A paper describes a structure:
The defense-associated sirtuin 2 (DSR2) effector, a SIR2 domain-containing protein, protects bacteria from phage infection by depleting NAD+, while an anti-DSR2 protein (DSR anti-defense 1, DSAD1) is employed by some phages to evade this host defense. The NADase activity of DSR2 is unleashed by recognizing the phage tail tube protein (TTP). DSR2 is arranged as a dimer of dimers, which is facilitated by the tetramerization of SIR2 domains. DSR2 has a two-domain architecture, with the CTD responsible for sensing the infection signal and SIR2 acting to prevent phage propagation.
We next determined the cryo-EM structure of TTP at a resolution of 3.1 Å. The majority of TTP could be unambiguously built, with the exception of the C-terminal portion (aa 240–264), possibly due to intrinsic flexibility. TTP proteins polymerize into a tube with a diameter of ~50 Å. In each layer of the TTP tube, six TTP molecules are stacked in a head-to-tail arrangement, forming a hexameric ring structure. Each TTP subunit adopts an extended conformation with two β-sandwich domains (termed BS1 and BS2, respectively). The BS1 domains oligomerize into the hexameric ring, which is decorated by the BS2 domains at the periphery. Notably, one helix (aa 68–78) is docked into a groove created by these two β-strands and the “head” of the BS1 core, forming a network of hydrophobic intramolecular interactions, suggesting the importance of this helix (α1) in TTP assembly. The BS2 domain packs against the BS1 domain of the adjacent molecule, further stabilizing the hexameric ring. A β-hairpin (aa 36–56) extending from the BS1 domain interlocks the hexameric rings to form the tube. Together, three major intermolecular interfaces, including the two β-strands, BS2 and a β-hairpin-mediated interfaces, facilitate the TTP assembly.
Numbering used by the authors:
A (entry chain V), B (entry chain U), C (entry chain T), D (entry chain Y), E (entry chain X), F (entry chain W): 1 to 242
G (entry chain H), H (entry chain L): 177 to 242
Amino acid sequence: MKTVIQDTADVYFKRKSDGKLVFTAEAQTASFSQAISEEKLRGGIGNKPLYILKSEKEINLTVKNAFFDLEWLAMTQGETIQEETKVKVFDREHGLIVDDTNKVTLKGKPVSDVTFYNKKGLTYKIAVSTDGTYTIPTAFAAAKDKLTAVYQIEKVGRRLAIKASKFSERYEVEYRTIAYNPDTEEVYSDIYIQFPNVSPSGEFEMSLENGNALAPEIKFEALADTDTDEMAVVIEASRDEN
Amino acid sequence: MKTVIQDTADVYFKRKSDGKLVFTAEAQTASFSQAISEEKLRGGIGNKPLYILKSEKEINLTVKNAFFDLEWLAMTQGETIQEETKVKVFDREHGLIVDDTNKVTLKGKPVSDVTFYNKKGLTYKIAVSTDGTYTIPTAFAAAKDKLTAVYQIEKVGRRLAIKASKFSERYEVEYRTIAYNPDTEEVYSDIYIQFPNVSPSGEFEMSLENGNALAPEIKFEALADTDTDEMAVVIEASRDEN
Amino acid sequence: MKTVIQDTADVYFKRKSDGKLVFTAEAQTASFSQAISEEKLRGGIGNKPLYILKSEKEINLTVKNAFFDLEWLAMTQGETIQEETKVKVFDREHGLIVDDTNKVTLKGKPVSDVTFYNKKGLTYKIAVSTDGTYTIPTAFAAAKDKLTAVYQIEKVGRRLAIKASKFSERYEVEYRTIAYNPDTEEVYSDIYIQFPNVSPSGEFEMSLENGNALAPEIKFEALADTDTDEMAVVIEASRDEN
Amino acid sequence: MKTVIQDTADVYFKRKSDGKLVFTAEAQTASFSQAISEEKLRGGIGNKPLYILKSEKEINLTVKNAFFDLEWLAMTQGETIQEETKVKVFDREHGLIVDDTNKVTLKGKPVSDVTFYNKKGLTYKIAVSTDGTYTIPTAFAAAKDKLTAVYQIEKVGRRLAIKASKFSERYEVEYRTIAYNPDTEEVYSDIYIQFPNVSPSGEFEMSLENGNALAPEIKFEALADTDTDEMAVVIEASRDEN
Amino acid sequence: MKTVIQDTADVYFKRKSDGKLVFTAEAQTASFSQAISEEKLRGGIGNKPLYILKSEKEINLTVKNAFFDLEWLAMTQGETIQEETKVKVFDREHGLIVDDTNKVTLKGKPVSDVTFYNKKGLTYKIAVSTDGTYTIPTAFAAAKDKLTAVYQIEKVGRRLAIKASKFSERYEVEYRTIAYNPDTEEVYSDIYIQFPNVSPSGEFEMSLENGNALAPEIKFEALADTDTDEMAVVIEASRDEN
Amino acid sequence: MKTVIQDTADVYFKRKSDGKLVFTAEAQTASFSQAISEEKLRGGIGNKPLYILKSEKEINLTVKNAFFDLEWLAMTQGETIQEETKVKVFDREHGLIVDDTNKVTLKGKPVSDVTFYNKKGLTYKIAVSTDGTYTIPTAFAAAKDKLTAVYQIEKVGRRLAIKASKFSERYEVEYRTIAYNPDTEEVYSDIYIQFPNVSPSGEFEMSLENGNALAPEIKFEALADTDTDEMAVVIEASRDEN
Amino acid sequence: TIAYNPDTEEVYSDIYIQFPNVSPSGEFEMSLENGNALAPEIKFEALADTDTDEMAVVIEASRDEN
Amino acid sequence: TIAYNPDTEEVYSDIYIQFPNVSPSGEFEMSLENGNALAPEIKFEALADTDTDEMAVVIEASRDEN
């Protein structure tokens, strides 16, 4: 039946090896496209077409979300997220006042050499202090000087590694959307588009800009199923025949 | 007569071997274009053009609709829609509360393993249970813990399959529109454009965006009729001579 | 004299073989352009230009109209328009009610097997009956079910055929515009641009969009005259010298 | 001195063969540009540039006017305007009423066959009657039937012919513009950019569109002078020293 | 130190051969850019990047001013401005009334043939009259016929010549701008960017359009110093340490 | 966990050889991107995709700041800032009034020849006066007429040099951003994208335009780590598990 | 084949080239490549006719003389 | 021909190459094609001078020493 589609899709990804299931229900774009190669075989007196050679049917997918998820990076890289891993990150503490006896005391737990910045913009790299007390030179600051310290600390959290020779697995994807009724103006059916053998594409981009909410985007390439030789299945199951 | 056209076309497609007929009366664009290859033959002292070699008269068609219809994808793929087919789709259930004995009861009909999601985005893939009771570990959730279950269910509906080796048949297309009278401002005639041997083009794209009504689009390539060697026929039958 | 041009041109095409004359006076654009090939000879100590080789003067024309005219398509195709030809077109009938005895009666005169559409987009192809009464199965509709019928009818009108091996003949084009007098703001003269040997170009496009008035457009290529070796003649005739 | 230029240039062209002089003072754009070819000679260890090779100094000009002149087309084509020449142009008469005896009387002086157009856009090509009375068939029109006649007439005016193998000769061009004084806001000098030896360029385009005032444009290519080997002489002559 | 730059730069050019110094303090854009060529050397199993080859470090400069200087054109051409040179330019005067005895008296100092223009755009090229009285033919004008005369006069001014085989020598360039303080909102420092060996680029363009103030633009290519192998030097000098 | 990112990233760079640490906390853009090379291996009857070859995983970075830092230019060039260096720059003095005895006295400390500019843009280069008194010729200026002097002075400050055969060395970059909770609208975690082994790209551009604040931009290319073969490490440590 | 008329762009005549005694040449090649449409090719060697001693006859027959 | 100066970018010298006893070679070709400007070409064979036994002399004359 001729129906109206005015919404986006809810997307489900599944991994073929172990069945790891991811889903997104706050998408902003879900699209797929098909392209083939055509050529004309000609001859005779007139240069008139005699045959058409068609081959290389190819299908691509693109999904663009509204929130951020590390699992999307996982699918793109074909890696795994290690939970509760210890990591070493940078930290900044600014506003330390040099005392009368040119001693500065840190309020954090450094792991590497501390670097101090004076108001003019010069650097001084000292090693870690046991009591966290540093004898700053008089040529750097004298008294009532606000200085800044940049040191590495230790943190625990999730971790994902992007290796130089690790690629992606094969997945099974499905979009779901709804189709309305032009006459009655009420939901008529549910439309499911299923791809049974896809490969995540290795090209992605992440761009952080001030005042802009990040919308990550992922791409896939659809391949023919190993036995049924399908590439995609479109289903328009209705809401009264279930 | 010099007339004014200010509307789009109603489109009719007919399959050759079978005779299956599809019509669209809510179109948004119907266009056709012609291209031709030209070359000049030069010579003599002045190096002046002497002859023009012309060949390769090619015609293309494009139709863009306002509603969605699966038969358009059927024409593009050269396949058939199988009514009332059983299919496996995904479903989501929100708000399951883990009870005192750490047990969650499902109100659906899963077919595969049920995957559970806690509020911190962690997964637990339990196999299907008979009664529909699942013992969620204490390390996963506690009393009054909303969870999520993603399971596969069964539905029935129309199914269309896209394969890697099946292509399109040959069709017969016709546009119909109306032409007005500049002097009297009333409908003067009906204009019919008939293509008797076309081939659907395998290139298409379907993009679902939030808040945007989908307008599907299809393309064809026109070929010369095998008997009459016609590529298209334009008719401007009047509304007084019928 | 230095004059002002602020208008389009009335165009007068005319075939050479027979003298068939077509004229348009509601044009929207009339343009012509000239191109030429240049090259430089170099040599000596310094690599200085020593000669400019000029050749291949070419002229093209473009006309864009405000009304639709089948004779323009005839001119592009170099083909004639047959008058009062019998043609077989499509027609649609909506709202046929299935009676108590599942009989549907058509009000038209089908010339091929009718196709019926129910409210759920299902088709039923039945050969044309004598009285125009058809027995719709109860599995299709029972009673008070609006149905749609698509059948072919016969009409009388003009007909133009586009063939795969038919090309255009030669014409003689001429524009005409008026030039104003900057000092006195009155029509000073008439400007005629005459091309005596042109060839219509087969590239054309017809796009029908809802809410948009069609503006057809045609192109020509100008060639040198056989004897006088002219390509175009510009004439400015004053309105006092006649 | 540092001055402000905020105007266009009055342009003067002069033919070298005979001294024929054309000027335009209602110009709209006057520009000239210089291009040159450079390359680097490298070598040794490190692949560092050891030399720069420069050659091919070229200069181009462009002038765009506000009025229309046949003289500019004459410069581009290197032809001559043969004033007061007899020409054969088209004309059209609307409203000829066919009288009772089916006769139409023309009020013009045809030279070729008259073509009649009826209300439905059908043609009738009659030869030239002496008295100017034509017998229109009953199958074409009846009493009180406004018809239209298209015929060729004779006029006199200036004729410019564009040829397939005729090119342009050399010229001498000069711009003129004024410069202001940023301190006193008064004219300080006059800039006279002079090109001793240029060549008109064959590229040309005329486009007539409804409601648009035509602005013709011409392009030149500057060449080195025969003896002094100059290509342009920028002069800034003050108006308090002449 | 982290500062804010929100202005252009005063620009200074100095010639190497003789030390001629030019400066611009009303600039509108001063920019420089660096480009380099990079390649990857790969090999082994896995095709991994094993080395990076980088070379051809190149630097370019661009300056755009707000006033007009002939010295900029001299700099680009590598030539010299010759002060107080006699030149022959065009002049024109409107409204010469032809008297009763068809004599027109010029009020200028012609050097070449005087060309007369009537109100109908026709020319008459008369030689130079000793007294300055010209006998205009009665077939050209009559009593009270305002005419136009175009003739060449003599003036004195600065002359710059552009030749086909002369290029630019080497220069030394410097930009100067100021850098503010984010905290105190006061000027903090002066930024000097010095290029010690540049070559002016021969590409330039000068376009004069009505109502548009001309902004000339010049480009340079920076080259390594012959002994220090420096391409540019950036100096950030404070206003308290001088 | 599905989170919202709406901010930029604080960026930290560290030099590998000596540990010199730079940071920016007023950034405007921090992005990284991944690219990969894919190819399809086909064969057999049907020309079907039989294998996919993937290699050349490449990662790039781009940072765009809001303030100016000479250290960024040093990082791109792989050079060092030699603070407190003596430099020779240009200076300008306006309003020098020529006295009765055509003597002009400077108020600065010239190092090289002083160049004088009169009101008509004429130059006069004189050597350095011991006392600072110059005898301006009466042919240049007479009295109560203001002149301009351009001379070189000496200053002290930082100095970064750019050479033709010095490139950048390897660094270690890290971003930091915060993520929000869609339900509670509170900060949930911190994201630390870490690149262990990058290479600065020697392609920058500085453009100073009037009334436009400058935002410098730097680029990097990430390389695989020598032992772990990682290219980047996305970390999403939380703010309640820490 | 057909020959066109440069002045009027209409088929002027038909051109027939007849060889009355040829011998097929045994050299031939058949190459099957994926994605490539095969175009077979054959060669002949022309010999003089036994009696008339002709080797080939070129005929141009106009479309108005039949 | 002329020879430049890598340092000063100005013309430095004139290079003269002198052959005192040559024989023009009889091989030549002249081809006229539409749209192609003809560039004729000639060849010689250099022979030893009858008394000095020189086949060629290369002279590099400066523009300041003449």
